Amino acid sequence: LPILGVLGGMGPVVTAEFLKSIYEYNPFIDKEQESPNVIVFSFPSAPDRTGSIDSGKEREFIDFIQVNLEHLNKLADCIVIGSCTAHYALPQIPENLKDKLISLIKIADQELQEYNEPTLLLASTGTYQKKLFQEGCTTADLIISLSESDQKLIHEMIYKVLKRGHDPLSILRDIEALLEKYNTRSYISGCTEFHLLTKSLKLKGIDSIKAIDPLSTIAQNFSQLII
Amino acid sequence: LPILGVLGGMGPVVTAEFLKSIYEYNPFIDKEQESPNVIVFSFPSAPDRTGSIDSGKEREFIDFIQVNLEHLNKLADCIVIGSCTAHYALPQIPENLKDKLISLIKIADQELQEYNEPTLLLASTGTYQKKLFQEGCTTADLIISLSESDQKLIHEMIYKVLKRGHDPLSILRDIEALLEKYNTRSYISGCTEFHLLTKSLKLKGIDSIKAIDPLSTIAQNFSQLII
Numbered sequence: 001l002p003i004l005g006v007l008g009g010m011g012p013v014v015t016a017e018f019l020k021s022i023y024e025y026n027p028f029i030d031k032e033q034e035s036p037n038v039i040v041f042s043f044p045s046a047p048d049r050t051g052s053i054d055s056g057k058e059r060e061f062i063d064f065i066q067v068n069l070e071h072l073n074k075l076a077d078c079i080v081i082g083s084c085t086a087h088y089a090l091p092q093i094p095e096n097l098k099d100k101l102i103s104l105i106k107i108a109d110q111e112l113q114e115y116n117e118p119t120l121l122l123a124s125t126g127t128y129q130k131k132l133f134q135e136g137c138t139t140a141d142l143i144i145s146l147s148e149s150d151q152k153l154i155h156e157m158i159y160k161v162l163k164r165g166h167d168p169l170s171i172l173r174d175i176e177a178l179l180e181k182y183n184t185r186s187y188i189s190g191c192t193e194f195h196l197l198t199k200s201l202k203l204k205g206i207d208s209i210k211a212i213d214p215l216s217t218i219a220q221n222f223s224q225l226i227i
Numbered sequence: 228l229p230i231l232g233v234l235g236g237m238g239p240v241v242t243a244e245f246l247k248s249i250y251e252y253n254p255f256i257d258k259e260q261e262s263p264n265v266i267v268f269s270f271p272s273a274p275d276r277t278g279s280i281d282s283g284k285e286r287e288f289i290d291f292i293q294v295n296l297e298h299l300n301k302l303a304d305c306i307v308i309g310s311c312t313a314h315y316a317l318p319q320i321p322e323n324l325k326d327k328l329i330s331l332i333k334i335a336d337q338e339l340q341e342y343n344e345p346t347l348l349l350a351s352t353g354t355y356q357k358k359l360f361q362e363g364c365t366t367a368d369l370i371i372s373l374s375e376s377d378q379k380l381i382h383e384m385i386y387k388v389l390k391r392g393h394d395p396l397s398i399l400r401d402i403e404a405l406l407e408k409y410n411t412r413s414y415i416s417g418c419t420e421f422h423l424l425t426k427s428l429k430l431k432g433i434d435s436i437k438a439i440d441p442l443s444t445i446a447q448n449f450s451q452l453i454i
């Protein structure tokens with residue numbers, strides 16, 4: 001009966017891998033009928049998120065979301081947007097469409113409250129420009145913001161490696177480096193692509209790092225979260 | 228602009244992995260905007276397909292499809308059902324809903340015509356009961372039907388291993404065995420789960436076997452097939 005709608009494609013590789021996680025972390029006992037009921041709107045054609053801010057038409061982007069939320073509100077019970085940045089348009093949307101919503105920022109916020117140690121916000125320059133975490137989280141004093149320099153190095157990783165579907169473990173060495181620099185053993189997948197990393201770490205059984213990955217957190221607690 | 232709708236979840240593991248293939252086999256050059264626009268209805272709760280035939284209510288199952296096709300006809304340009312068996316309900320659906328459809332049986336049929344050697348139809352007992360390939364394919368004389376005995380051994384693989392998300396390569400030895408028995412170096416993923424195998428073979432670079440996997444064939448030729 002209960003159905004999740006996912007407005008994704010903003011990271012189509014991640015979008016796919018996220019759905020894969022949902023069934024990985026909710027494997028049925030006897031019958032498939034048991035398993036999670038998901039709807040995925042995978043639209044890569046969504047106007048570039050970090051590039052919609054740096055041009056005149058954020059107007060075009062907000063429309064995209066509104067249109068697709070109007071659809072998903074009918075077909076789903078709960079709704080998730082598979083892009084953190086993308087949440088920046090939610091001020092502009094009428095409150096009725098956001099009734100079913102589950103903020104990736106709120107999920108990250110709760111996770112960080114329980115973990116309760118300083119944690120590095122891994123996000124692109126454009127994700128940071130929107131200040132979604134600094135405004136949105138109650139646990140904001142525990143968030144370590146990257147330097148503008150390192151935000152661009154993370155922009156490289158996301159777009160040049162992760163988004164292109166290459167092995168997430170390749171960037172691991174560069175991420176371990178940052179973690180020592182900013183002096184934590186933990187990260188927030190500000191940019192959703194780090195769902196891909198989060199998995200690859202768990203797969204390798206590398207427990208040295210604590211990952212606050214909202215998409216993992218959703219997948220795992222699907223049975224609870226979806227009403 | 229062009230959008231594919233996928234009525235899936237009949238194999239939720241496959242459904243996820245299929246979407247992953249779409250982006251694996253259509254990796255963008257410069258911008259993600261380029262990439263494939265997909266909608267996925269992943270509903271595991273679809274009444275058991277092989278078990279809907281062996282009870283009174285195939286009536287319940289046909290409704291499920293019709294309802295979801297009515298939806299997808301609005302939101303998509305082309306439509307695919309992520310289950311071969313599931314095509315057995317298409318006689319009962321009004322022709323207007325099937326205007327956008329892409330038959331997994333037709334795709335398998337074309338592929339087999341070009342390959343043009345005897346090829347083993349790997350499918351469950353229930354998939355066979357519906358005789359979808361024997362009636363649907365023009366290339367039907369090239370299809371080698373499994374023995375009823377071996378259909379149940381494939382039922383085991385599908386449900387006990389593949390559907391439960393375990394490594395598809397584990398069954399490989401048992402599949403190589405069948406291929407030698409029925410005396411081919413080729414197979415048809417009658418049951419869609421063998422998308423999972425098809426990938427795992429390609430990943431390993433095992434070219435000894437020729438796989439007629441419709442879901443691979445769709446993913447690869449997305450740019451062409453979707454109008």
Ligand SMILES: *[C][C@](*)(C(*)([O])=O)C(*)(*)(*)([N])C(*)(*)([O])=O
Nearest residue numbers: 010049083084085191192
């Ligand atoms: C901005 C990035 C994206 O996917 O468009 C990032 N993954 C995000 O939104 O969190």
Ligand SMILES: *[C][C@](*)(C(*)([O])=O)C(*)(*)(*)([N])C(*)(*)([O])=O
Nearest residue numbers: 237276310311312418419
């Ligand atoms: C019957 C099986 C299923 O997925 O329900 C098989 N994968 C098929 O339909 O091809």
